[PDB]
Amino acid sequence: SQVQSGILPEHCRAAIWIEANLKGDVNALREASKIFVDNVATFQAKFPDAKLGAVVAFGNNVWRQLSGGEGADELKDFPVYGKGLAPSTQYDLLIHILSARHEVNFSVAQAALAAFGDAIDVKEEIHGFRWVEERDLSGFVAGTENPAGEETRREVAVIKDGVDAGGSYVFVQRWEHNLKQLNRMSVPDQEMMIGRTKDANEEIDGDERPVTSHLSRVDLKEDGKGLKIVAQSLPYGTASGTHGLYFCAYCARLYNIEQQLLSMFGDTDGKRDAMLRFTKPVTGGYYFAPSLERIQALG
Amino acid sequence: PLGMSQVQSGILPEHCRAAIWIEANLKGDVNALREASKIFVDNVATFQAKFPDAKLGAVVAFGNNVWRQLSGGEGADELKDFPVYGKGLAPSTQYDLLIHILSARHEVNFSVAQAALAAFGDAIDVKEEIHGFRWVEERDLSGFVAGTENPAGEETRREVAVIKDGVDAGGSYVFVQRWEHNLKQLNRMSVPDQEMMIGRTKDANEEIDGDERPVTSHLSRVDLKEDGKGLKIVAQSLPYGTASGTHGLYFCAYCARLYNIEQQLLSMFGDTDGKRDAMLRFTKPVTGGYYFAPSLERIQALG
Ligand code: HEM
Ligand code: HEM
């Protein structure tokens, strides 16, 4: 089973995420998905330098229909976390496009919209960009502990066997940063909020940083085994309007993502991520990304 | 370089892949713009030093009312608020301040835009912020190549865009106008009909002779000569928007005289000969403003 092309690429410069609801017959998604994955292959051949990839992924209700109820055992609608502190905006379809070249991504996004046509209702379209020094707009480097290299990224993100082999679970969550609130914090206070130093990007020892620090919330182990995810997140927005991080992660099980969210939003131990001092999530959804062979076998 | 006037760095660069434009109104006393503009151009120099490979430039430019105040009424003789053209076919949304940032790196442009906002602070009310991107093959989102006849090279671009002498030497006039394309409407037109609308062939970008295209074609509207002398402008326009939402062309041009821009607008919008640009069949302008970009030396004499 071959993995969709947008899960594994590293260090992308730009992305487009489109989140949409199904308005028409669920069966219209079958032909549209095949059209789109062929478009992606054609664009990769036309723009080899772009290192383009893309993913089509499906919400719980749609995917149960498309799959006949087989597999994707962990899939569910995204719930609130923290009783609502993390909101839920579960849609039916996610299209994630990434590459070195925003302009290529834009053409690919137009192709996705042509493939799905008026069967879908676009609810969100976000254009991500890698910022200076791969920093989040807060000024902290983002991506350091992300699984590195195809071998490890496959291990973390790609389902190994059975009916879902080559697929992955996806989580997307848009955050809105209040950089004015951030900038009122001293740099040492910001560093204790994240759990790494700001300029030099060195981890602060877990025994010496707050348990509410981001790293303490999300660097989770189960009897010594890390709960890893493959992030594809990027900055987005305008300088004068809304801006933040579009969080996007892939994992061979939803479990690892969910444990991190239960931790961040106070459900596990009553403590909340210190980043909520300056940024907040405003969307959230879970999706299942089938393998390419599974997509071809739809219609 | 005493006794000379240095152009702001964003007027002349060619083939930059990314831009940010910010348009804003002044909220309080115009004096706030003096120290903010000096800070901003200094920040630009710092970003150029930090990111030499970005090939970054930027411009700060001013609307008529605030430029008249800051200049004491000296110079900028052609400057005026952007008029409506075609009785409203081209709307007017004249603001007080234009920031234009362009480079080979969107991420550097973003940092520079943040610096501009920090410099001006609450003295301004941002009315729009547009992130331009060069599309594939330098095409407009309509699919036609954009930029072919734009003045080429530093020498010619300086001749067209940069005022040569007098108090305004090193300055330029700026026009910005955001267009919203209806690509569904465009795609209802056959490609031959689109070519007659533009005046060039779509795939190969060959000019269609003036006698073989309608007078409403875009090239017939805007390729204007006065007794054989072309009325040139230096465009810095780029595509913008989302695939599923608003998208189009953010039109931006610089010229040493506002006259050349105005003649093209009077032509496009029906004021000269009663005919209008065929591109209005699929796209429309929704903003419009004129600004004056002083020389970099003069931004330093503010205060
Ligand atoms: C505003 C939103 C977020 C910001 C700004 C942010 C920022 C960061 C930063 C600066 C780091 C440290 C550098 C690195 O290793 O990448 C980090 C690490 C990490 N983040 Fe986040 N993050 C956000 C949301 C999330 C969410 C929602 C999750 C999971 C559901 C998450 C999971 C992780 C993980 C697993 C790590 C690596 C921890 C480690 O093993 O050291 N992050 N994040
Ligand atoms: C929807 C907005 C616009 C679109 C899509 C558009 C597109 C084009 C295209 C495809 C060309 C031919 C290729 C080239 O030489 O660049 C062109 C040329 C040109 N455009 Fe536009 N344009 C727009 C607005 C404007 C405006 C508002 C003006 C002036 C006020 C203008 C002035 C020019 C000029 C002077 C030329 C060169 C003509 C020549 O000498 O051959 N354009 N434009």
Ligand SMILES: [Mg+2]
């Ligand atoms: Mg660790």
Ligand SMILES: [Mg+2]
């Ligand atoms: Mg000509």
